[PDB]
Design a protein around this ligand. Structure first.
Ligand SMILES: O=C(O)c1cc(C(=O)O)c(NCCCCc2ccccc2)cn1
Ligand SMILES: [Mn+2]
Length: 228
């Protein structure tokens, strides 16, 4: 079934119904009017960040290039590979971009410091795919440009997701979510999940260790906040 959408819930409501029990939710009316939502065109991104060097994941491999090169090679021209400017602390690198976002007030319910919140950018063409994986902190994933298809599996379902047994990949499923090998991973078919299409201005709360899988449906720009 679908992830529920709530408009600006109170801190106490979010705390009691979603944060403490660990249940996903989409927050509406929270990041709606952040400046990024109007300002961040390709042209703007090129104007403010075009010359800066960013890590880019291709395919698999990790390379470096300028924002301008990334846009030219992987977005506007018929790309030859899938390239993704993934999990990069762009706003520490380019503080002028911090003015276009905020830290959600709900982060202040956590047991951590705001100085410890990790803000990552996720910028890429249609077709970028995460593997199904879990992270060790809470997350608000803020959609700014385009749409993402996201599937969520509780940590209670980890057995049916066949994590990699290599310690470096223990947080990642062996299963291709959208075309699963059920002859090898038969328990995956039975595992209940939530899903959504996350659209611009929406925030997805992914509870700590919730398994998530993400596919960009369009040219996409997302900002995640990892917090505790
Ligand atoms: O916010 C999160 O914690 C979060 C967000 C996303 C997201 O994509 O939005 C995500 N996906 C992983 C990227 C996979 C690498 C890759 C993919 C295709 C091509 C080359 C490289 C993981 N986690
Ligand atoms: Mn993640």
């Amino acid at each position: 079934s679908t992830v529920p959408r709530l408009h600006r819930p109170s801190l106490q409501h979010f705390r009691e119904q979603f944060l403490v029990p660990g249940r996903p939710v989409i927050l509406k009316g929270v990041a709606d009017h952040w400046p990024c939502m109007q300002k961040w065109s390709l042209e703007y991104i090129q104007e403010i960040a075009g010359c800066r060097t960013v890590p880019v994941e291709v395919g698999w491999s990790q390379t470096l290039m300028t924002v301008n090169e990334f846009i030219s090679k992987y977005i506007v021209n018929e790309p030859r590979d899938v390239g993704y400017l993934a999990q990069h602390q762009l706003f520490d690198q380019i503080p002028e971009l911090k003015q276009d976002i905020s830290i959600p007030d709900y982060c202040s319910l956590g047991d951590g410091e705001e100085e410890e919140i990790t803000i990552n950018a996720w910028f890429g063409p249609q077709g970028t795919i995460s593997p199904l994986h879990q992270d060790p902190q809470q997350n608000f994933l803020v959609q700014v440009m385009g749409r993402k298809y996201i599937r969520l599996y509780s940590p209670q379902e980890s057995g049916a997701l066949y994590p990699h047994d290599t310690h470096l990949l223990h947080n990642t499923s062996q299963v291709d979510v959208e075309n699963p090998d059920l002859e090898k991973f038969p328990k995956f078919a039975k595992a209940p999940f939530l899903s959504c299409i996350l659209s611009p201005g929406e925030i997805l709360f992914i509870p700590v260790k919730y398994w998530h899988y993400v596919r960009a449906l369009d040219l996409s720009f997302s900002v995640s906040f990892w917090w505790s």
